[PDB]
Design a protein around this ligand. Sequence first.
Ligand SMILES: OC[C@H]1O[C@H](O[C@H]2[C@H](O)[C@@H](O)[C@@H](O)O[C@@H]2CO)[C@H](O)[C@@H](O)[C@@H]1O
Length: 387
Amino acid sequence: MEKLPPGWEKRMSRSSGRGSGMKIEEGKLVIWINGDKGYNGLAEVGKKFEKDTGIKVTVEHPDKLEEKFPQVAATGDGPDIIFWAHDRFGGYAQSGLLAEITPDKAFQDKLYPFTWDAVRYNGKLIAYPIAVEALSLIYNKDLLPNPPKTWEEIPALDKELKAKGKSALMFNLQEPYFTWPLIAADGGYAFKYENGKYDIKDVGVDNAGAKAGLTFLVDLIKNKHMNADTDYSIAEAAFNKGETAMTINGPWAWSNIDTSKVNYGVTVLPTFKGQPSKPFVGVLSAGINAASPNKELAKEFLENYLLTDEGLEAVNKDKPLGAVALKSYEEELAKDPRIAATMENAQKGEIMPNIPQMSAFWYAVRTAVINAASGRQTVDEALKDAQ
Ligand SMILES: OC[C@H]1O[C@H](O[C@H]2[C@H](O)[C@@H](O)[C@@H](O)O[C@@H]2CO)[C@H](O)[C@@H](O)[C@@H]1O
């Protein structure tokens, strides 16, 4: 084995009552999914399940559910099913919070092999794969018929649009997920992937490539092309109201842009130092709470209602999922240019590790970016800390 991620002391404080029966309600399904996803669409699938079974399906979307789940599940409470990108699930699994899932070989053949890989932890399947998420460059086609192919061009493009009372680019600077594609472009990485194994001793958050990418970000801010305060909501409002020509976001965001006046394109992220931006790619996945008394219901719901063409379509019509893991539905989606873009950024990026250390990693990088962007620390100082 390998050294446990930080916080064993705290996980042990949650020990009492863990398995000593604390109740999730038997005879229904409670599901957690992030509020940016198609949770209404998911609830519709839930209604279909209820019609066929008499089993009520309740979908909730609490803020910070990826942090709340291990807190509530460790005591044996929480949702029956938790949706999040696969990167959090190895930590959950190592804490004992997830049931191993048991799809037969027939079912497994309906999803792409690499998506099962993403939800396999220490040789065992610990969640159902749903969709493949990659960030793309989203741009206003009226403001910008030809989107920039490089990060390097964006300051000049900004000067251009500033003269027209617009700006070039706004995206969420508070979550490192969104700046990671730039940090990784010139060689930053999380953990060294050697011989099919992640080396937790070899972290690349402060190598030359990481520093170059983060420095480019902070220079954008220094030069008033971006603002360190910009978050998800600010950037989205600004793009969807036509004040900024570009944003960086995932497929879930398209629905809101659709309802806007903006005629937009979805495309490949620009290069940095001549190399592709490398988004960390997530597989939206559904795990079954180890403490759930409804595991067979959860299985049935996920395999026979959600992971179907009609199930994923209900969710997708609410908020687009991206490239889905279900082969039959993905062949249909693959024709959308926006999904093509999603797929290109996905293959240029890297499927996130699911190892238990990912939570600590993201927290470290989150702090590093925020501190460097605000000017509280220098790029070198901030990244040195993260290592
Ligand atoms: O920023 C750190 C954060 O990145 C990823 O979270 C994504 C998630 O994958 C997407 O589904 C979407 O909801 O946006 C999130 C970023 O705000 C990781 O999956 C997550 O563990 C990590 O903390």
